[PDB]
Amino acid sequence: MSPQELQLHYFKMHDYDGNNLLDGLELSTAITHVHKEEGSEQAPLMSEDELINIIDGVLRDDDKNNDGYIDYAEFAKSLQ
Numbered sequence: 001m002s003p004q005e006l007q008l009h010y011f012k013m014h015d016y017d018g019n020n021l022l023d024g025l026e027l028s029t030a031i032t033h034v035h036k037e038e039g040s041e042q043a044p045l046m047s048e049d050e051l052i053n054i055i056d057g058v059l060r061d062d063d064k065n066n067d068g069y070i071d072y073a074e075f076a077k078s079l080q
């Protein structure tokens with residue numbers, strides 16, 4: 001897919017609730033891409049547990065609004 005829609009890909013990746021937000025439960029699949037650590041769009045499958053903290057790092061830091069979820073504008077900033 002193309003990067004632009006791939007942003008919505010990170011959104012729909014685990015958003016089966018349509019609340020326009022992603023909790024860690026959702027983000028467990030998505031943040032593997034969104035939280036670019038040792039890569040850009042590529043999933044840095046380095047260590048699942050470290051990746052868990054990476055996911056936390058999203059809900060704790062990449063979440064700029066302190067809501068604990070990642071919105072389109074949030075992950076857009078995070079993946080770019």
Ligand SMILES: [Ca+2]
Pocket residue numbers: 014015016017018019020021022023026
């Ligand atoms: Ca959701």
Ligand SMILES: [Ca+2]
Pocket residue numbers: 063064065066067068069070071074
């Ligand atoms: Ca948020």
